[PDB]
Amino acid sequence: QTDMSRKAFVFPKESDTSYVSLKAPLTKPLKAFTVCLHFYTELSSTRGYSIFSYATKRQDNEILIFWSKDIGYSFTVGGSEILFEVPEVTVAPVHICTSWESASGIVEFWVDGKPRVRKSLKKGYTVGAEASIILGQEQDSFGGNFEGSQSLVGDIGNVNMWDFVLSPDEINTIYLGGPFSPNVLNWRALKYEVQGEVFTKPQLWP
Amino acid sequence: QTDMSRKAFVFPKESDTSYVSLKAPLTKPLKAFTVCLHFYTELSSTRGYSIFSYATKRQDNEILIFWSKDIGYSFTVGGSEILFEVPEVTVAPVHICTSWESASGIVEFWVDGKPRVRKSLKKGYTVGAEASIILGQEQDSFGGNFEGSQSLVGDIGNVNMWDFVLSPDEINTIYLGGPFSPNVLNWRALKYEVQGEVFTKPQLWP
Amino acid sequence: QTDMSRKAFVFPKESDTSYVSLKAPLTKPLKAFTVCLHFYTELSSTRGYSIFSYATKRQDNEILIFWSKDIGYSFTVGGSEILFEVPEVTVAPVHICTSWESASGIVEFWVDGKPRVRKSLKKGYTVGAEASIILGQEQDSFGGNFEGSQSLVGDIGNVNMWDFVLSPDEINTIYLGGPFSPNVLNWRALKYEVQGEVFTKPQLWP
Amino acid sequence: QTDMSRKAFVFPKESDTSYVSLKAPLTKPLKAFTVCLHFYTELSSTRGYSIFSYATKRQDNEILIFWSKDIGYSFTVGGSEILFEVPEVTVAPVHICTSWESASGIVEFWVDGKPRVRKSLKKGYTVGAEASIILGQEQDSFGGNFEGSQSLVGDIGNVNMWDFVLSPDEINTIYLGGPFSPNVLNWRALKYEVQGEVFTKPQLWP
Amino acid sequence: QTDMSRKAFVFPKESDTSYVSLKAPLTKPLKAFTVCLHFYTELSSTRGYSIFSYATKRQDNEILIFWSKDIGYSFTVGGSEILFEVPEVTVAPVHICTSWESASGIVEFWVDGKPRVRKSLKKGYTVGAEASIILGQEQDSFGGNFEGSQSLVGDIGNVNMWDFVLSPDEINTIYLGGPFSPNVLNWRALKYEVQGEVFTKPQLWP
């Protein structure tokens, strides 16, 4: 447990080896989740890259938040992909929240406090509880098989995770800096393992 | 009779079976009406869709609020169509109000509280009272004959209906969040039948 | 005699026969004037139309506020026209004031409270007092000879006329709301005649 | 001495005969100065024009503020010219302040209270104090030899001149309209001489 | 020790002879530094120019802040360049802070108080402390070999340097203007040497 308030991980150059593993304390697989984070990179108009990689032994892309070059955000649950297209590329730190619900198949994707349209993905599915959660790289195996061309060059912080769906009002307060209590991953009480060229500095965003 | 305050219908994927049917004890025939609603979809740049379908046994498009690809808003009364071109599209939730008056034929269209030009459509006409009112699909027959290529993928909410033409100040009240009392369809006292892949969730718009 | 406060004239479709005739107490040739009005149309990027037509038995375009397609505003006094070009069109209600002073020849044109450059037109000319003043049509003879290709389709209101040149501070209050007393045509004490399909409804602009 | 507060000289059309002559109580050869003024014109994308023409018996272009078409502002001291390029022209009234210092050669150019870079011009030169100062025309001789194609068509006012360089804070006050006292040319106590078709009217800018 | 508060060095025109030499209490090797300054120029779209030149006997480009035509900001340390692309150029005064840390190799670049992404440069290297610090000119040798082609035409001011990396909150204070004390170069206690055509005038920025 580390309090990472006002701190962010920094991956200053492209690599195959720099990553942070996030220790999720769980048993019950997930019928729903919400993932929020800040990140900052210039890669957006040169190549794709992995924002948040959640892998299980049977599924490498169990939850994957990814950026596809000339497309926008790619959201994947259980190997199935949905896109959140972005016409114009923004050059500044970005806060995203994303949720998915098994019961309904509804995914929500929130960019800088503003919501994209609701979409459907993996209705009735269950996300596995024994996971390998990675920042800075895209998993192709449980905890490994990284590709440098999918690596995050930049900052990533305020990563949080819930095992239910956040409401629009709740997302609004997280974004506005208000109080909250995540029950899967907590930035303020995070367990983690650093590997490779990655540093802990003060966050660049306000 | 359900209080749908702060909630919206969610049509998270394309189909020809998902819809909501709105019910009312319908009074005398209509010599005028106003219908206001919020909706949010990403379909505007890809194909057309139906936003509000009001059908009678005699006319499948008795009142139709439609979006027409590369053109803009389509507003139909008694089978006759009028257009409100929209040069660039906004990728955000949208609030609309629209009215028609039999006496003058005057049609109004309001987008996020701002009025379009007043136009003319079906003067002397009388809108049928025995009707089938549908969200999510375009009627080609009374209560049916939907087309998937005309389905709404997204959210729709705050649907209200009056049997008279709202003044500009009254439209202002509706849009700014003031209290009001609609006399045909009331989102706070909504009587409806849900069908296929439709969800009730908290509204995405303020 | 009629108080037209907060009400506008509505010309909902193209026609040869819909117009309003404005009656002024007027009885001394004009050596100067000012005309202010509000109008709203979509015709601007399709064809020209007449905003304010002041005909005299010897001159059909004695005063004419007109929109020329792909050019901008046209202002004519005693048959002589000058242009106020607009590179880009606004799709919203628009408030205009315009003045002319025989003594100097100076013409002013104000759009949404914002002045164009001062220009010169018909210095030392005199504007006739016996007049036919028409909204919705362009006159080619005292009180008639209209053409549908020059008709106003939309809303026009807040029409006021003075017999002297308003100052910049005076136009500023006229545009923002303020009190004023026009001495030729008064929107709050207006005498008029309606002809054809033209309607009185609440104004769309604040 | 006339107080020209809230008033401006109007040059309604093109001519080589319309101009205002400004009377300084001039004194000793100047080794610094600052000139501020408001002007409004539409000639900007058609031709150039003189804004401020200061000629001495020996130097016709002793101080000249000019607008060069397709380029921007042209500032000339002692016959010697420097440019201030303007990529995009705006059609609105504009306030400019310019200064020059002999000791350093430093020229300053201010447009709407915002400064252009500092530039170098005529270091160690002295500006003749026995001068003819003209508005609305460009001098090619002491007090004459105008050219119609260099003529200002539009309004010019708020003309003041000091015999020293104004600081950034001092300019900011002038631009904001704060209280100030010029010692060479005072708009509030102006001695001038009008010739041709030029009119005094209320200023069009705030 | 001169307090250069509210003042800037002005380089009115291109040359290879005008420069300012900054003098620092010649301490020990730098394992980290931060440099902050204001500058205002119009050269960005015509050619590249040197903002801040820090040169040792061994290395001509020991710390070099530069502007590269059609590229953006060039930040170089111990001969290794890193780029910060700027798609669109702002013709206004600009405040930058840059920092480098040996331990991590992380560089930071801050434009008008907004951070660019963290990049990597010269990890483990050490910046020499026997230095020549020049404004207005680019060094290709210790205190010499200037190319007018690389000279700053404009204003430069509020130069401050620290021997450690400033935090995000610290940089906000420097940009918004709060109180601070730099330990390498203090603009409020500056020792310097002026050469050529360079003057001291009031700063143009707040």
Ligand SMILES: [Ca+2]
């Ligand atoms: Ca993968």
Ligand SMILES: [Ca+2]
């Ligand atoms: Ca991979």
Ligand SMILES: [Ca+2]
């Ligand atoms: Ca139909």
Ligand SMILES: [Ca+2]
């Ligand atoms: Ca259909």
Ligand SMILES: [Ca+2]
């Ligand atoms: Ca005519």
Ligand SMILES: [Ca+2]
């Ligand atoms: Ca005609």
Ligand SMILES: [Ca+2]
């Ligand atoms: Ca000349």
Ligand SMILES: [Ca+2]
């Ligand atoms: Ca001349």
Ligand SMILES: [Ca+2]
């Ligand atoms: Ca060098």
Ligand SMILES: [Ca+2]
């Ligand atoms: Ca060099």
